[PDB]
Design a protein around this ligand. Sequence first.
Ligand SMILES: CCCCCCCCCCCCCCCCCC(=O)OC[C@H](COP(=O)(O)OCCN)OC(=O)CCCCCCCCCCCCCCCCC
Ligand SMILES: CCCCCCCCCCCCCCCCCC(=O)OC[C@H](COP(=O)(O)OCCN)OC(=O)CCCCCCCCCCCCCCCCC
Ligand SMILES: CCCCCCCCCCCCCCCCCC(=O)OC[C@H](COP(=O)(O)OCCN)OC(=O)CCCCCCCCCCCCCCCCC
Ligand SMILES: CCCCCCCCCCCCCCCCCCCC
Lengths: 100, 311, 102, 480, 160, 300
Amino acid sequence: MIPLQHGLILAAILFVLGLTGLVIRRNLLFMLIGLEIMINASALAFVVAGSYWGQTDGQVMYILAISLAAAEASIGLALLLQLHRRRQNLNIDSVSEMRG
Amino acid sequence: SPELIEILLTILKAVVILLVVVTCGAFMSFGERRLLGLFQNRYGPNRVGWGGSLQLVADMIKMFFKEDWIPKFSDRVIFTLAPMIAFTSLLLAFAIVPVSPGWVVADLNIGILFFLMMAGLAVYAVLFAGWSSNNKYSLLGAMRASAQTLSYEVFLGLSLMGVVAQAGSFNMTDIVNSQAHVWNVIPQFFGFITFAIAGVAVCHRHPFDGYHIEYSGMKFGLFFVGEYIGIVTISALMVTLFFGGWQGPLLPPFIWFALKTAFFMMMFILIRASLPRPRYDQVMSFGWKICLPLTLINLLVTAAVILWQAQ
Amino acid sequence: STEVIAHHWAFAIFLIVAIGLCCLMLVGGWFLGGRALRLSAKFYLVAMFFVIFDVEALYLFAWSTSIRESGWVGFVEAAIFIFVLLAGLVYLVRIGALDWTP
Amino acid sequence: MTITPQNLIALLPLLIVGLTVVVVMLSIAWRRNHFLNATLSVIGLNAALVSLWFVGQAGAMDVTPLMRVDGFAMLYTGLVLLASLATCTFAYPWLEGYNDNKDEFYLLVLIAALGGILLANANHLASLFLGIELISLPLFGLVGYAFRQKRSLEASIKYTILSAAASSFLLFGMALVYAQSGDLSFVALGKNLGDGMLNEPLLLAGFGLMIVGLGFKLSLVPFHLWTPDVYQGAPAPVSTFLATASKIAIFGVVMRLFLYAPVGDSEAIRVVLAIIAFASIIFGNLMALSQTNIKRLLGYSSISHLGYLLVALIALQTGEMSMEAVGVYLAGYLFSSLGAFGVVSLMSSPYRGPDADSLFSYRGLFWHRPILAAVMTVMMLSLAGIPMTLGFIGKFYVLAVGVQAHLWWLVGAVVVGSAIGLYYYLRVAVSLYLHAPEQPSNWQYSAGGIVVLISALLVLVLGVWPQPLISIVRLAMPLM
Amino acid sequence: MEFAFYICGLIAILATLRVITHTNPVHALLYLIISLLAISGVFFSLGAYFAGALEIIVYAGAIMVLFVFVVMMLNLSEIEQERQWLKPQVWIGPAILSAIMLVVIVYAILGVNDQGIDGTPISAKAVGITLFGPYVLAVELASMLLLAGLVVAFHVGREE
Amino acid sequence: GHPNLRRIMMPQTWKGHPLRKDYPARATEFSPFELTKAKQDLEMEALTFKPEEWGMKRGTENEDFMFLNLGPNHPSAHGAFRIVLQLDGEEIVDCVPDIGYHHRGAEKMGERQSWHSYIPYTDRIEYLGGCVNEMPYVLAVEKLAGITVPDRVNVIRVMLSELFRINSHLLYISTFIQDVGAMTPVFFAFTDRQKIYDLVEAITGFRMHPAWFRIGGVAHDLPRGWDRLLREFLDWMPKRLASYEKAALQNTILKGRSQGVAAYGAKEALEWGTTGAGLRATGIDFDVRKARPYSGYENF
Ligand SMILES: CCCCCCCCCCCCCCCCCC(=O)OC[C@H](COP(=O)(O)OCCN)OC(=O)CCCCCCCCCCCCCCCCC
Ligand SMILES: CCCCCCCCCCCCCCCCCC(=O)OC[C@H](COP(=O)(O)OCCN)OC(=O)CCCCCCCCCCCCCCCCC
Ligand SMILES: CCCCCCCCCCCCCCCCCC(=O)OC[C@H](COP(=O)(O)OCCN)OC(=O)CCCCCCCCCCCCCCCCC
Ligand SMILES: CCCCCCCCCCCCCCCCCCCC
């Protein structure tokens, strides 16, 4: 009864909103938050696509997606902790020394 | 219509289960006081009412009419939000337990998975209470307690996975029906002890117990009644998962369920009254180095035994 | 079927009445009565260990419900999975990452 | 499907590298020894490289709904393993001066090589995703291995955030493609579309998002801005690995994706990739003009050479020698990048703390290090397409492939970008021999010098006689 | 089935747009947790029971707890006192390109065949059967990916 | 040459020196304004703490040396006191005890009471001791008066001192066990303390501070039937003491909490003046009851 187009529209909307959250925020924590929103939205897209066809492939790729999301959260938060330890701030344009 | 009659009867049974478990948690706190008195060679509260049974109503009235105090420089929403988490998470964790054939709230196909979601959501109560108190002492205490309950939550589902593998399904009706001949405590004894330790630790019970020195009035009552609701929840879960559930030879099944649950609650009381408290790092070492490999080896041995019998 | 929709209604009423009672007694508690440092990285370490091992746990959750139909080859794959997981755990323990005290 | 023991023989390098990861991890957990862990890692990589012979003796077969193994996959597995071995060899003298733990580097190199092998044998969108992630995450660790240094932590943060964004883009694109098609296999993308209905909007948009992710992973314009900063800030062996192995494996899985899928017959994707390749060649050659830092120059070189590779990619459906040209160019580019970044890593080692400058100052290198300067100028000539070098043979192959399919705009782009490359490569090569006032002692530094020496001699020999490389690339043939 | 799907999708979208615009990190993480609960409800409405189980168990129950732990570790200055992501001259560009991407993706989505999702429950048994059948190397190398993330995060996140 | 010569019994803003003979002993006028001033001092002390006047160095110079205050409120029988801890994670880098929150001026009161009426003040020096606290003062006054007490006085005073020693040791063991985490032994040991208090009430007429020793003897005689209560207590004790050992003092969690924690050798005990169980745990057999005997302890 629920159309497939509605599910992909919702997933696309959540993904692009996560893209705004990644771009417009200078704080690295909100950048990681937006990254997690986008990967979770794409995992929702895979689940919708798998539930339309009646196959577990969408759920398997969802499991791979959340594994990537967890490990990326670990690495990004470790890097954020190192940045806060060695710079005492979370400004992302403060880490801009290499150019040209 | 008979369909609407059946719907109303199921709703009535569900709300009866809800009020029964809430009243059982509150009277289990009263039984905490009475049984601590019994274990410590005294009486406990036995003056307010016939045998002390009206001490609970007076205590709840006192916490109702206590002056509520949200701290001035706190975060109001998070500070009030932690107690409904601590109550509702363990209540809905109890919501999946079939107390009797036909007296079940929801035959969810996930079941113990749903208990895992609620146990995962339960840590936000401690974290939110630590942060929202605007107190660095409570913040440090809640960081330590949340690290404790994470290190002991990491093997909760892995302890339950032996029962899940033996049942072959995530539904609790199948779990309590697969214990018809032999109860799951006999094959899954290592899973049983690891699940008991994890369930004690995620309920922040002794000896795994500050981040409550800023709550007062009815918020403290919410935290404590939610903790006892979690005690009843874990006891009923281990009854349904390791000790046959409602199944029993002679007595009616609800009587067997109540007797086993009461036995496990009095085991909670005895565990608090008997054992002392280990140190923080020793608890960390026991939760990481010992319990998690034990659950992994138990799951491997359970799978090997299951595939061995089905040649 | 009538049974499944009846139990869905019962679960919905269970959730609604639980939330309503809890917030209601919050309202009763608020309504009555008259008025008058730097942490360490070990917390992050154990939390990230918890997250990684919970994803390993979710894989074992998916495995454990379907051992009978997966057969012995599923047991072999999960044995490799669990051995890799235990090798990682031994690695974390041995280098003093999981030791809370320095 | 099920897994047979013969399929386990076809799984040999994957299992060998995974078991080497396990063994190196347990050796690290036993006792922290730099030499023992490095020796175990290179022994396992060599074991996978020599087990490729047993894989080829087994044959070509479809080991999983995920994986397919053929000689094409063995070729890219060998390239990735050679890049990883060179990375370890260059990384040991850099790691002698590291005050913190030196042992996690080889574990991360091993896991990234494992991801490269999975991407080499990939025949599924799940395998593509997992190989890309298994390449990226150890590179997140490796780029910021010297996290106390400012530039390394800078490059680590930039690479981690940008590659997480590209992972989200690629995974959403695979979600859209799977929603349109219904099966996640490579050969089952647009199969149900027939009689001019191949250009499906959902499938095209999904594949465009995959193009965005893979173009980040291949430093293609306009997803190229990360390349010079991450290349410069990372340690020089990490820059070597990120220039060679990641690019080779991701371009190989992109080759397999655009070969097997019927989506690659679409003219819209061909035009989009033509625009991307044209802009990549022109931009990656033009922004390397005024570069005085060698790492950023090699990053723009990587952008331009992946543009040349994309130009060779575009004629896959029209031509027939596209994959052979891609393999020859990938071998030559691998050897050239290995030699150049190896010279940079040797003359930038040992790691003298995070508080000291890591600037190269290659001017006057011949007057105290003649062999390293000779190897470096040979490989600067190799990257320019100048003859008696293997890069010239690769550029000749790319130009022949472009001429065969009448892709004349790409041919003119290759010529113009080659001229700009001549300018800046020859500027670096001459500056190696000028005069400068300012200007080892172990067998591992000598081993790295030996590695770059054999790389330079291989480039020269296969430039003056490229027939054995052509024969062994034509021997590696996938399944049409 | 559809009713819960629509309400949970609306709640997820609203919580996401509250996340991307808020300033308090703990409030942002709480709104993100609410969004993950809504997305889990979307999963349960469509029949993917295991996906919703891992949505609350793992993403809402582990990853958000890790973000919460980091936020309380930092004691989170220089963000709240300017609030430059609300003035239009900063966010109107990314919002416009964002909306352009959204209309492009929606236009691509709307031109596909649709038979409707039946909501048939694909339980955890089928996911486990196919996860250890045609997806063996996916499980093994995903375990190695988690291992790599563990090693990287341990190496970076020390204090010395 | 003293490193940090600051006041330890009185607050730092205290004019005069109390133990001088030209200082008034009785309480001065109370003022709530001074109470508000010291409240303000406490409030800005917790916010603007300066780890320099206390003799500590490295005032969070490592960017992780957090600062904690243990007291001054203390939910235990020891009493109110402050420790300011400098912490690296969970490690205690340095700590400065802040005492003086229980100063009753007992010596200045000794300059103000007679030799007879000062005995109750000698009781409250260590309120878990009672007659054990009364004993050295009355022995010193008997030295000043040239009094040699008879044997029955010595045996009576030894009896009461040993009873109060058992009372104090029971309270100490129960409070230590409660500090580890077990709860029941404090209830059981306080029941035993009630048995002791029954006997002491029969003997003297009070529980905690009997004020029963006198210069040259004791206040009254032993009542007719004290031997029955002493026999009942001596029959009641040892089974319960073995039960306490088995229930809590042999628990391996208590052993893990207590063994090897805050250990020092004989040199640290000698150089700091630590006496009692802390000195005899180092192997230095120095008990005053055996080395320099008093009050007829040789006969036992
Ligand atoms: C900066 C230097 C580089 C400049 C850019 C790169 C070169 C651009 C060449 C543009 C060629 C435009 C061709 C336009 C028609 C294409 C379609 C067509 O009908 O092609 C005819 C034919 C293919 O059809 P076929 O069946 O083979 O016909 C028999 C032909 N004997 O086609 C063929 O058989 C092949 C046609 C080949 C044409 C010659 C290509 C190379 C010419 C020399 C280099 C370019 C000119 C000199 C440099 C310019 C100034 C710098
Ligand atoms: C008759 C028409 C038909 C035939 C056409 C034949 C085309 C191929 C043959 C002609 C090629 C022309 C190349 C012109 C530039 C030659 C190189 C040169 O002059 O280099 C030196 C110059 C630096 O010298 P200086 O003036 O001191 O600059 C200070 C900067 N430090 O260096 C620089 O300024 C930087 C050099 C960058 C790289 C070289 C420029 C490449 C431009 C595109 C090449 C292809 C052109 C194709 C045809 C275009 C139209 C003729
Ligand atoms: C609903 C029903 C549930 C009711 C509750 C039932 C279950 C209760 C489970 C309680 C679990 C408590 C776990 C405590 C773990 C402590 C681990 C630890 O490290 O303890 C510290 C102590 C010494 O550590 P170590 O490092 O050796 O010290 C050397 C340095 N001085 O180390 C030791 O002393 C080593 C031994 C530690 C404890 C071993 C396991 C004891 C488990 C509790 C007793 C259960 C008895 C049966 C309960 C009823 C069963 C039906
Ligand atoms: C094309 C392949 C490589 C050919 C040889 C390139 C050069 C390699 C190094 C050999 C020695 C060069 C010596 C240069 C001496 C310059 C002296 C200048 C004096 C003013």
